[PDB]
Amino acid sequence: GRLIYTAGGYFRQSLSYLEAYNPSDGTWLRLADLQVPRSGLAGCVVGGLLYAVGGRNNSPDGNTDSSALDCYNPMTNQWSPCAPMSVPRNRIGVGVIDGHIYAVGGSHGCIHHNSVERYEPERDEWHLVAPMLTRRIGVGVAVLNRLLYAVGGFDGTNRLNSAECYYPERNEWRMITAMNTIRSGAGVCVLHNCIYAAGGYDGQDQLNSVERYDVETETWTFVAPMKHRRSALGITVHQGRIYVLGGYDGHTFLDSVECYDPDTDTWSEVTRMTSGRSGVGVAVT
């Protein structure tokens, strides 16, 4: 019985919540707080351990962008700090290839990173890899067929519909086909042989549209849209379905969790988070 973990987030200020949803029985479970509140972070899993990467803490004391990598062990319900990233990365994107965690883009103060770095859990070390062709914060990242995709985001001036693919064996990036829509802070994940980009912000409105890149056709297509417009949403995959969690719709911080079944091209509302929030990190184990 694998669970959907949601870490951190934003509502009034950056948050410390770690909660777990069980889709097969609809229950939520409150787990140990993050040591430091964070929003705009990302979550991923390696070898049954949950990692929370980057983000920022906007609080009464001011703002501090995070270079933190922290590791939560579901078996002990304990957080452990890991080696810091080379630089703080707010609104980071993250993906996993061959047991390594790739930290992509994001921001530190006013610097919008094109840089990328890779964590090896067995050594507790970060190493720089080739930088992206574009500076991207609020970037969505997905891994399919041991290739890493960075989609959308914000370069410091414009929000982006562009996307690019990283090839680890040659340590190089190339542009792929651009999305149909500019999306900053979209939900990006992989289901089956497609990369989905759900929601985000286009510079004017929050979006409920969801487009997917089929890697065999190199084409982006709109599928069924979400019920809720949402940016800074969490997203993940559980048992061949996409789960999107929370976000901001332009007026409300959502507690809604919607579920997409690609067999039927339909979204249904499956649960609610215990309170509304945006900017979460999400993963499954």
């Binding site: 705009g40 609104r91 900053s184 802070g185 940016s231 800074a232 900017g279």
Partner: peptide
């Protein structure tokens, strides 16, 4: 994007 003040909301995260």
């Amino acid at each position: 994007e003040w909301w995260w």
